[PDB]
């Protein structure tokens, strides 16, 4: 069938697609995240993400976990800086119980002191696991140095707040952000009326349009971390346009033109111009890709470079030189169309999976408030002209730069030098 996009008067999006799959998937995409935080409550979103199985008003922690496992289901909390999504997935027959459990978890959070104090420890473990790959830390520093507020907030609880998040803070966050207007219940494999019924059964109580954070402001700082690892992970970005704008699509096309994550295993990324440009200068092991983060209010476009400490400066300069060359106008229409093809294929393959489709629909409902068919997305992608890509390149090249680098910085250049 088709997506049954609907908006209740309170402001809650309910979308359902009856794919007739053996297993269904229901996700409540609450518009909350690190962005909607202030200095006093930094890290609260992280604990909320970790506090999925805490005892709720209707169901005990024991009951929650035991039931979810007994049906073989799974409850996952995916928290981006702007959207925190609670998703339940299980077989179709037992979907109702997991639905009740999910809405119990979201609607009625009972943050008992002892349980919150228990999960405070798990906070550190999760952050440590996430930070094993340097890229996570590098991106956190990137967002911190790019913005002065909102988006600058990290997705992992800061160290000084690891054991100091309070139940009252969690309650306040839920009350002021987990609101009906900021919520979007999207479920694949379930009927529309059941979704409407459950949504009106639990999520109705919280009034919509809760506490709203301020728009992020581009700081353009340089956060340099000296950790001693031989490989230096550096990322130089500048403020791109926010998602939903045509310039955002132009920036995505620009990202694919420059080069995105490899399409061939153990490939030299021949189409990716950044890789060739750096390779002609750097014959040492390296990896350069285009970073394009697009958030609701602002966006970031840049180049991520991984290379040896001595040769990191050469990699960064070469990649920036490639981007400058594109900005100059040396852009081939063949490359433009190829990048458009890559973007369209990437979008379609992303929405191919059940998880991909769920997250895409949730995002569209949460920000746009409507479902855009993939065909329309592809039409938007091809609508971007070459001039638009070159102009996005110009915006990056002649733009205030925010850089975050982690490793044996050493030769690693500074924003003023770049």
């Amino acid at each position: 069938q088709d997506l049954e996009f609907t908006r209740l008067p309170n402001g809650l999006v309910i979308a359902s697609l009856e794919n007739y799959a053996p297993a269904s998937r229901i996700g409540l995409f609450i518009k909350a995240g690190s962005r909607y935080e202030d200095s006093n409550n930094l890290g609260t979103s992280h604990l909320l993400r970790l506090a999925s199985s805490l005892t709720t008003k209707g169901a005990s922690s024991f009951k929650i976990t035991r039931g979810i496992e007994a049906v073989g289901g799974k409850l996952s909390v995916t928290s981006t800086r702007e959207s925190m999504a609670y998703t339940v997935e299980c077989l179709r027959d037992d979907i109702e119980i997991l639905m009740e459990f999910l809405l119990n978890v979201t609607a009625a959070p009972e943050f008992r002191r002892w349980e919150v104090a228990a999960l405070q420890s798990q906070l550190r473990i999760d952050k440590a696991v996430a930070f094993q790959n340097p890229q996570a830390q590098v991106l956190e520093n990137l967002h911190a140095a790019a913005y002065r507020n909102a988006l600058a907030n990290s997705l992992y609880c800061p160290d000084y707040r690891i054991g100091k998040v309070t139940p009252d803070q969690l309650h306040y966050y839920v009350q002021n952000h987990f609101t009906s207007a900021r919520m979007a219940l999207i479920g694949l494999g379930v009927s529309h009326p059941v979704l409407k019924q459950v949504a009106e059964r639990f999520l109705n109580m919280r009034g919509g349009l809760g506490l709203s954070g301020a728009k992020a402001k581009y700081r353009g700082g340089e956060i340099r971390d000296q950790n001693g690892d031989s490989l230096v992970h550096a990322a130089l970005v500048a403020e791109s346009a926010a998602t939903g704008s045509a310039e955002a699509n132009a920036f995505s096309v620009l990202q694919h033109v420059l080069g995105a994550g490899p399409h061939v295993k153990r490939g030299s990324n021949a189409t990716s111009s950044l890789y060739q440009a750096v390779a002609k200068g750097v014959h040492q092991p390296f990896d350069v890709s285009a970073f394009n983060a697009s958030y609701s209010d602002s966006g970031l476009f840049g180049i991520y470079t991984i290379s040896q400490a001595a040769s990191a400066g050469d990699v960064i300069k070469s990649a920036y030189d490639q981007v400058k060359t594109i900005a100059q106008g040396n852009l081939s229409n063949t490359d433009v169309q190829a990048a458009k093809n890559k973007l369209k294929a990437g979008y379609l393959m992303s929405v191919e999976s059940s998880e991909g489709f769920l997250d895409e629909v949730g995002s569209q409902a949460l920000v746009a408030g409507s479902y855009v068919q993939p065909s329309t997305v592809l039409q938007q992608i091809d609508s971007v002209a070459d001039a638009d890509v070159i102009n996005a390149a110009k915006k990056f090249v002649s733009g205030r730069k925010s850089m975050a680098a982690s490793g044996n910085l050493g030769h690693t250049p500074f924003v003023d030098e770049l």
Binding site: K74, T78, A130, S289, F291, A293
Partner: peptide, 23 residues
């Protein structure tokens, strides 16, 4: 497509996940 850092930790009945942006 370069990986939104996809740092979700594994789990059952409670599996937190996070994502940032392309790497």
């Amino acid at each position: 497509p370069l990986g939104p850092f996809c740092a979700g930790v594994v789990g059952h009945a409670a599996l937190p996940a996070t994502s940032e942006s392309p790497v």
